[PDB]
């Protein structure tokens, strides 16, 4: 079985693209080496292709089908509901790819009867014909980086007509928000905020007598996902306790568009056809990490891992267990490797077990130290600041449909990179545009969120704790990652920041209101006399429930 099978045919733009970082009057004020910063286009579509196209081979033992049993018996216990037409339409994001049968996203969002009639169509064709392949696009990603030691090439998004999106939601929004947590208990990441990731790290770390730990790297995760993987999903959704209506959609969207299909480019030309993961269906951030978590469990008990604790996160994995000493625990790795590889998860990187918990990097993030005011240890989640100031060379030139610079502030507010940096030069932005309280689009865990710029203190303080205003004393492992990323790509020195930052604080300062607020704390770290620095009021007013309880990468959702 063929994860792909290519007709020869390209996976075309359906726009040009740029590769080289666009320069504009603000760029030098990030970085000075620009010729490090470039975005992936079509035109490396085919390394992709060759990278991403393999036989799979599967063996599945004992273990396997008894953590199946498992996770099937806890499936069971969820009750998933159909979500309405205009509740999915709802979910759609302003700007989702429109549809090829006369309608966008916005028309979608308004309820027209041009796109709901369409919609419904859609919906009874799934309940009627449950064999007939559903037609999909192929693109080429258009995504920023940093040339790194050892230029990548684009990654390739598959996904069907608008259509079909909210006909996905109807039927499984309910279903991929609520059974991950319930199947997979604490080891569910993305029912957790950056800090209660860590919290989860630290307290399984401290529960074992020698801790040990490591990340899987999964080569190719979605080409290795095979129509044995996408069947066994849908046994587990059909546990739920679920409408008839909804049974039939999804054993319809499992057999007509999960399992496979035909791949068409932006020209409407075939290009070959799919037997793995689809990386832009609803139930992509799901399936995976149910696959993830399945087979790694399974794996643990194949290596006679001691008590593993698991934490997945799609197709991200790290495992944390007892210790059994240097040479013992290699040999165990290498057993789990095995079994992940019999199960069709060869890693890409080998991995290796590590026994300080801020060298293991999972959703390329690690747990770090530093201090608040009082001198206390606060435990919080950064990460490698390469690829986010990457992005945000790009986006301080280009206006984006994803900001990534405000989605990296709240997940890595407490972090020296996104304070020093990140805060300091788009919040100079914003004041010299006065858009301070312009809106902007952002993903958390790949939902989209609309979020305000002046409600960050609050956002800050509710996720991260007041601590996230005063973290000083940052660990010389993290003080050295950010020095050398600054000097890759050319970046101003603190000196430089700290002037600028006093500089955006006292024009906060002068605004009041919100601004002030944000002039007063995300700023506090400038100043030489440090300030007050106490709970703030309206921070309780915005609905912050609903942000981290899933993941729905690829999956075309928007949160508002
Ligand atoms: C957000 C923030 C908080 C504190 C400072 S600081 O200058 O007081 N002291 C500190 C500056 C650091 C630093 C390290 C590497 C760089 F390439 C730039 C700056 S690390 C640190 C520390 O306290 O451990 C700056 C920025």
């Given at each position: 079985s063929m994860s792909y099978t290519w007709t020869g045919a390209l996976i075309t733009p359906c726009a040009a693209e740029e590769s080289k970082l666009p320069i504009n009057a603000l760029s030098n004020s990030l970085l000075?080496?620009?010729?490090?910063v470039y975005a992936t286009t079509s035109r490396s579509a085919g390394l992709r292709q060759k990278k991403v196209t393999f036989d799979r081979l599967q063996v599945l033992d004992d273990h396997y089908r008894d953590v199946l049993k498992e996770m099937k018996a806890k499936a069971s216990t969820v009750k998933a509901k159909l979500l309405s037409v205009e509740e999915a339409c709802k979910?759609?994001?302003?700007?989702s790819a429109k549809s090829k049968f006369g309608y966008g996203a916005k028309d979608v969002r308004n309820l027209s009867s041009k796109a709901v009639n369409h919609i419904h169509s859609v919906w009874k064709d799934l309940l009627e014909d449950t064999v007939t392949p559903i037609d999909t696009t192929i693109m080429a990603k258009n995504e920023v980086f940093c040339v790194q030691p050892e230029r990548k090439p684009a990654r390739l998004i598959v996904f069907p007509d608008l259509g079909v999106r909210v006909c996905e939601k109807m039927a499984l929004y309910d279903v991929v928000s609520t059974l991950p947590q319930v199947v997979m208990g604490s080891s569910?990441?993305?029912?957790?905020?950056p800090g209660q990731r860590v919290e989860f790290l630290v307290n399984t770390w401290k529960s074992k007598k020698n801790p040990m730990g490591f990340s899987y790297d999964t080569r190719c995760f979605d080409s290795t996902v095979t129509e044995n993987d996408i069947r066994v999903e849908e046994s587990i959704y059909q546990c739920?306790?679920?409408?008839p209506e909804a049974r039939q959609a999804i054993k319809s969207l499992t057999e007509r568009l999960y399992i496979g299909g035909p791949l068409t480019n932006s020209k409407g030309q075939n290009c070959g056809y799919r037997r793995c993961r689809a990386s832009?269906?609803?139930t992509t951030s799901c399936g995976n990490t149910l696959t993830c978590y399945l087979k790694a469990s399974a794996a643990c008990r194949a290596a006679k891992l001691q008590d593993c604790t698991m934490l997945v996160n799609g197709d991200d994995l790290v495992v944390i267990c007892e210790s059994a000493g240097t040479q013992e625990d290699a040999a165990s790795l290498r057993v789990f490797t095995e079994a992940m590889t019999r199960y069709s998860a060869p890693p890409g990187d080998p991995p290796q077990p590590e026994y300080?918990?801020?060298?293991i990097t999972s959703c390329s993030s690690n747990v770090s130290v530093a201090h608040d005011a009082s001198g206390k240890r606060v435990y919080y989640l950064t990460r490698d600041p390469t690829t986010p100031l990457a992005r945000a060379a790009w986006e301080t030139a280009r206006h984006t449909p994803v900001n990534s610079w405000l989605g990296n502030i709240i997940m890595y507010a407490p972090t020296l990179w996104a304070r020093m940096i990140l805060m300091t030069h788009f919040f100079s932005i914003l004041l010299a545009q006065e858009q301070l309280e312009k809106a902007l689009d952002c993903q958390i865990y790949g939902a989209c969120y609309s979020i305000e710029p002046l409600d960050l203190p609050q956002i800050i303080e509710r996720?991260?704790?007041?601590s996230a205003f005063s973290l000083h004393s940052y660990s010389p492992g993290e003080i050295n990652r950010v020095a050398s990323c600054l000097r890759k790509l050319g970046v101003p020195p603190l000196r430089v920041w700290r002037h600028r930052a006093r500089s955006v604080r006292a024009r906060l300062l002068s605004q009041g209101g919100r601004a002030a607020t944000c002039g007063k704390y995300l700023f506090?770290?400038?100043?030489?006399t440090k300030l007050k620095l106490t709970p703030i009021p309206?921070?309780?007013?915005?609905?912050?429930?609903?942000?981290?309880?899933a993941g729905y990468s690829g999956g075309d959702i928007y949160h508002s």
């Amino acid at each position: 079985s063929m994860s792909y099978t290519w007709t020869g045919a390209l996976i075309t733009p359906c726009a040009a693209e740029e590769s080289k970082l666009p320069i504009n009057a603000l760029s030098n004020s990030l970085l000075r080496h620009h010729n490090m910063v470039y975005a992936t286009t079509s035109r490396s579509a085919g390394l992709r292709q060759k990278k991403v196209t393999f036989d799979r081979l599967q063996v599945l033992d004992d273990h396997y089908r008894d953590v199946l049993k498992e996770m099937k018996a806890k499936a069971s216990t969820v009750k998933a509901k159909l979500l309405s037409v205009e509740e999915a339409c709802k979910l759609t994001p302003p700007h989702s790819a429109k549809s090829k049968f006369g309608y966008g996203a916005k028309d979608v969002r308004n309820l027209s009867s041009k796109a709901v009639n369409h919609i419904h169509s859609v919906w009874k064709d799934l309940l009627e014909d449950t064999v007939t392949p559903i037609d999909t696009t192929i693109m080429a990603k258009n995504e920023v980086f940093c040339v790194q030691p050892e230029r990548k090439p684009a990654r390739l998004i598959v996904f069907p007509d608008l259509g079909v999106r909210v006909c996905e939601k109807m039927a499984l929004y309910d279903v991929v928000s609520t059974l991950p947590q319930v199947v997979m208990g604490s080891s569910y990441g993305f029912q957790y905020s950056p800090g209660q990731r860590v919290e989860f790290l630290v307290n399984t770390w401290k529960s074992k007598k020698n801790p040990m730990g490591f990340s899987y790297d999964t080569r190719c995760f979605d080409s290795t996902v095979t129509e044995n993987d996408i069947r066994v999903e849908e046994s587990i959704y059909q546990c739920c306790d679920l409408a008839p209506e909804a049974r039939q959609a999804i054993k319809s969207l499992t057999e007509r568009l999960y399992i496979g299909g035909p791949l068409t480019n932006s020209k409407g030309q075939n290009c070959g056809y799919r037997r793995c993961r689809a990386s832009g269906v609803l139930t992509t951030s799901c399936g995976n990490t149910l696959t993830c978590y399945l087979k790694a469990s399974a794996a643990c008990r194949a290596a006679k891992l001691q008590d593993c604790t698991m934490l997945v996160n799609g197709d991200d994995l790290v495992v944390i267990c007892e210790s059994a000493g240097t040479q013992e625990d290699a040999a165990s790795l290498r057993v789990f490797t095995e079994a992940m590889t019999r199960y069709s998860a060869p890693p890409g990187d080998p991995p290796q077990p590590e026994y300080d918990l801020e060298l293991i990097t999972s959703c390329s993030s690690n747990v770090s130290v530093a201090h608040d005011a009082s001198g206390k240890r606060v435990y919080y989640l950064t990460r490698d600041p390469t690829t986010p100031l990457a992005r945000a060379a790009w986006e301080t030139a280009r206006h984006t449909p994803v900001n990534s610079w405000l989605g990296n502030i709240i997940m890595y507010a407490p972090t020296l990179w996104a304070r020093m940096i990140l805060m300091t030069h788009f919040f100079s932005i914003l004041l010299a545009q006065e858009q301070l309280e312009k809106a902007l689009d952002c993903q958390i865990y790949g939902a989209c969120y609309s979020i305000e710029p002046l409600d960050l203190p609050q956002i800050i303080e509710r996720l991260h704790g007041l601590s996230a205003f005063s973290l000083h004393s940052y660990s010389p492992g993290e003080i050295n990652r950010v020095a050398s990323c600054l000097r890759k790509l050319g970046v101003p020195p603190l000196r430089v920041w700290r002037h600028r930052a006093r500089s955006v604080r006292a024009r906060l300062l002068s605004q009041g209101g919100r601004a002030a607020t944000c002039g007063k704390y995300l700023f506090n770290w400038a100043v030489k006399t440090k300030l007050k620095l106490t709970p703030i009021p309206a921070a309780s007013q915005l609905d912050l429930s609903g942000w981290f309880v899933a993941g729905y990468s690829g999956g075309d959702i928007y949160h508002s």
